[PDB]
Amino acid sequence: GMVNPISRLMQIQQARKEKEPVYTLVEERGVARRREFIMEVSASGKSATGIGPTKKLAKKEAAENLLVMLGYGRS
Amino acid sequence: MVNPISRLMQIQQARKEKEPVYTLVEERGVARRREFIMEVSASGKSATGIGPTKKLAKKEAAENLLVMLGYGRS
Question: Which parts of the sequence belong to the DRBM domain (chain B) (predicted)?
Answer without folding.
Answer: 3-71
